[PDB]
Amino acid sequence: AMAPPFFDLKPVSVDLALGESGTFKCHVTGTAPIKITWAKDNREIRPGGNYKMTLVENTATLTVLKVTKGDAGQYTCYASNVAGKDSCSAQLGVQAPPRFIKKLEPSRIVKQDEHTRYECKIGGSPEIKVLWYKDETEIQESSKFRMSFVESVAVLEMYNLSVEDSGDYTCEAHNAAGSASSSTSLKVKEPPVFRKKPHPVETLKGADVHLECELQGTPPFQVSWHKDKRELRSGKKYKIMSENFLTSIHILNVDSADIGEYQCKASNDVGSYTCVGSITLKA
Structure with missing residues (x-):
C-alpha cells in the first residue's frame, strides 16, 4: 500500500x-x-x-x-x-430529433396580391435550425418572404403573392439528432379583370354585330352576358364565345331592341368582374 x-x-x-x-x-x-x-x-x-x-x-x-x-x-x-x-x-x-408538434395544412388557394402566413410548431433538442423551401429551393429572407423561429414557432409570411408562387412549400427542421419536415401545397390565382372598355359598336338594322371584351386572370371563367336585366344565351339570336382571355357576343339580325348597353360578367374562385359595352344604330 x-x-x-x-x-x-x-x-x-x-x-x-x-x-x-x-x-x-x-x-x-x-x-x-x-x-x-x-x-x-x-x-x-x-x-x-x-x-x-x-x-x-x-x-x-x-x-x-x-x-x-x-x-x-x-x-x-x-x-x-x-x-x-x-x-x-x-x-x-x-x-x-425535431418533431412537428403542429404541422402545416395540406393546401391553400389564395388571390394574387394577397398575403398568407404559415405557422409550424416544432419540438426536440436545441439548437433546431429551421429552413423553408419552395418546390425544393430554399426560400431566402426578404420583404416578400418573412421568416422567424421563436419559442418553438416557425413562421413564413408571404406578401404580394403571384402565380409563380404556386407550388409546394416545406418547413424542414434539423438538429444534431436528425430532421423533420412538414409540407403544403399553395395555389395562387388572379381574379378576372376586364381592363379595356370596348368602344361602342355601330350597326345597321338587319345586320349582325360583334361585341368583345378582353379578359385577364386565371381561367377557367364562368361567363354570362346580360342586357336589360335579362341573361342572353347562345341560340338563334346570339352566338356567345368564351375563350380564356376573350369573351364575345355576336348579335344576329339587329333590330331596335338590340341597341343599348350589354354587360359581360366573368368569375372564378377568387373574384369577378363586369365588362360594359354598347351597340348603337345607324339610320
Whole structure:
C-alpha cells in the first residue's frame, strides 16, 4: 500500500444523438491494484447491457452502446485501493430529433396580391435550425418572404403573392439528432379583370354585330352576358364565345331592341368582374 488513486485524466461530458454511441475515458494513478467501478446516477453499472466497460493498464472506459433517452445522466468512475479512493464524473446529454408538434395544412388557394402566413410548431433538442423551401429551393429572407423561429414557432409570411408562387412549400427542421419536415401545397390565382372598355359598336338594322371584351386572370371563367336585366344565351339570336382571355357576343339580325348597353360578367374562385359595352344604330 501507499499512494491512493488519483484520476490524472478525467472524462469529458458529451451530448449524444439517440441511436448513436460514445465513450467516456479516464486514467488513474496510484498503488496497484486499483479497483474501478462505474455508476450512472449513482447506480452501479453492471456488464451485459447497454454499457461496456474496459480497464486496460489504468485507462478506464465506458461505452454507451446504443443511446436511448434513459441514458442521460451523470456517469461516475470510482477508483479504490488500500490507500484510498478517487472518483470523477461526466454528464451525458441525449439529443432528440425535431418533431412537428403542429404541422402545416395540406393546401391553400389564395388571390394574387394577397398575403398568407404559415405557422409550424416544432419540438426536440436545441439548437433546431429551421429552413423553408419552395418546390425544393430554399426560400431566402426578404420583404416578400418573412421568416422567424421563436419559442418553438416557425413562421413564413408571404406578401404580394403571384402565380409563380404556386407550388409546394416545406418547413424542414434539423438538429444534431436528425430532421423533420412538414409540407403544403399553395395555389395562387388572379381574379378576372376586364381592363379595356370596348368602344361602342355601330350597326345597321338587319345586320349582325360583334361585341368583345378582353379578359385577364386565371381561367377557367364562368361567363354570362346580360342586357336589360335579362341573361342572353347562345341560340338563334346570339352566338356567345368564351375563350380564356376573350369573351364575345355576336348579335344576329339587329333590330331596335338590340341597341343599348350589354354587360359581360366573368368569375372564378377568387373574384369577378363586369365588362360594359354598347351597340348603337345607324339610320
